[PDB]
Design a protein around this motif. Structure first.
Motif, mmCIF file in Angstrom:
data_model
loop_
_atom_site.group_PDB
_atom_site.id
_atom_site.type_symbol
_atom_site.label_atom_id
_atom_site.label_comp_id
_atom_site.label_asym_id
_atom_site.label_seq_id
_atom_site.Cartn_x
_atom_site.Cartn_y
_atom_site.Cartn_z
ATOM 1 N N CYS A 183 -2.713 -3.321 7.027
ATOM 2 C CA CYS A 183 -2.215 -3.418 8.389
ATOM 3 C C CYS A 183 -2.389 -2.054 9.055
ATOM 4 O O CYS A 183 -2.846 -1.097 8.420
ATOM 5 C CB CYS A 183 -0.743 -3.857 8.409
ATOM 6 S SG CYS A 183 0.498 -2.587 8.104
ATOM 7 N N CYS A 202 -0.272 0.885 7.287
ATOM 8 C CA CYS A 202 -0.923 1.269 6.040
ATOM 9 C C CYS A 202 -2.343 1.777 6.247
ATOM 10 O O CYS A 202 -2.838 2.578 5.455
ATOM 11 C CB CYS A 202 -0.925 0.097 5.059
ATOM 12 S SG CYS A 202 0.752 -0.453 4.643
ATOM 13 N N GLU A 239 0.794 -1.224 0.000
ATOM 14 C CA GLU A 239 0.000 0.000 0.000
ATOM 15 C C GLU A 239 0.835 1.288 0.000
ATOM 16 O O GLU A 239 0.476 2.262 -0.661
ATOM 17 C CB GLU A 239 -0.941 0.027 1.202
ATOM 18 C CG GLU A 239 -1.981 -1.069 1.203
ATOM 19 C CD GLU A 239 -1.506 -2.337 1.877
ATOM 20 O OE1 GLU A 239 -0.290 -2.625 1.835
ATOM 21 O OE2 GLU A 239 -2.359 -3.055 2.442
#
Ligand SMILES: Nc1ccnc(=O)[nH]1
Ligand SMILES: [Zn+2]
Ligand SMILES: [Zn+2]
Lengths: 189, 182
Positions: free
Chosen positions: A112, A115, A79
């Motif tokens: 996560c 990100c 990301e």
């Protein structure tokens, strides 16, 4: 360089950020993202990939993949790379900037914690995931301490969230990755 | 910075220099002091009011420093923490600062991490986090910290990372306020 943050992109990713592409369907979009996953894994990277599209036209803008280990950079998630390359190409820290198109970030797995915020600042207005958090957890890869209802937190900020898209082929890709990780050589990998 | 073969974010002169000038600040206030000086230069260099740097916890050796470069670098991910952590993992040639055989690493930072960097620190391998300005101090000058899990400090502590904050805090605010004033 040693006087600038410099994360190198593997040939296939360069190509992915080079050839023009337009995928309408969410399936199509995630499909291409999952193609970069298999590639990444074969380029010594984590089983994670992402891409930023123009959401309302399907124009691929930028893609990224996990280059943490090969890249010796813990922040080089999928990301972060796609969100940056995307911001660099459109030359602005804000993808939500005045004039730019509405962007969308298609990722192989629910983001996560790191990100998660990265997404909030980026300027995209939509997040599209494949592999649920549990699938990722299911094979190590920690999602990190995300706040309660992070998904809700995003919807609130106008970032529409979606998960499960092509989750079946996504979890498969996670598994053959895990299947091929140990040190004892296996020619089938 | 739009390239092709790699994601590239340039650092201004002062910062470039900061990562190549030998430096050893044993004391904690010394480390923070240096970091605050960086903030100033960064503001002077069209950057946000945020700076930070990784130091080998015990020795106090400067490994790498990073500031906020979001705007000038057209990268929303370019926070003081992300850069400082990444250049450190670069110098040491490993994505893991808590890696085997490497002196424990600490990240002294101008303000308390944003939920992003929050996760960022966790994955870095740094074994301690010393902050200056508090979070309300940050939201006070109009900057978001994002939604963090209830008791983030706990999360870090629990994950082998020692949290310590409020250091030189007051000096870090005169810098924030100044920035906001202009
Ligand atoms: N704490 C922070 C808030 C906003 N931007 C930053 O770079 N850092
Ligand atoms: Zn992530
Ligand atoms: Zn941050």
């Amino acid at each position: 360089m040693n006087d600038a943050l410099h994360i190198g992109l593997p040939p296939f990713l360069v190509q992915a950020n080079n050839e023009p592409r337009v995928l309408a369907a969410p399936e199509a979009r995630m499909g291409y993202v999952l193609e970069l996953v298999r590639a990444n894994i074969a380029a010594d990277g984590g089983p994670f990939a992402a891409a930023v599209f123009e959401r309302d036209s399907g124009l691929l803008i930028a893609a990224g993949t996990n280059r943490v280990v090969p890249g010796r950079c813990s922040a080089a998630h999928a990301e972060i790379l796609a969100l940056s390359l995307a911001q660099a190409k459109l030359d602005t820290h804000d993808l939500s900037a005045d004039g730019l198109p509405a962007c969308e970030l298609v990722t192989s797995a629910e983001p996560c914690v790191m990100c998660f915020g990265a997404v909030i600042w980026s300027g995209v207005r939509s997040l599209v995931c494949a592999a649920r958090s549990d699938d990722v957890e299911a094979i190590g890869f920690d999602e990190g301490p995300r706040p309660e209802n992070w998904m809700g937190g995003l919807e609130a900020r106008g970032i529409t969230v979606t998960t499960g898209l092509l989750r079946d082929a996504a979890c498969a890709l996670l598994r053959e990755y895990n299947a091929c990780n140990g040190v004892i050589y296996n020619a089938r990998c």
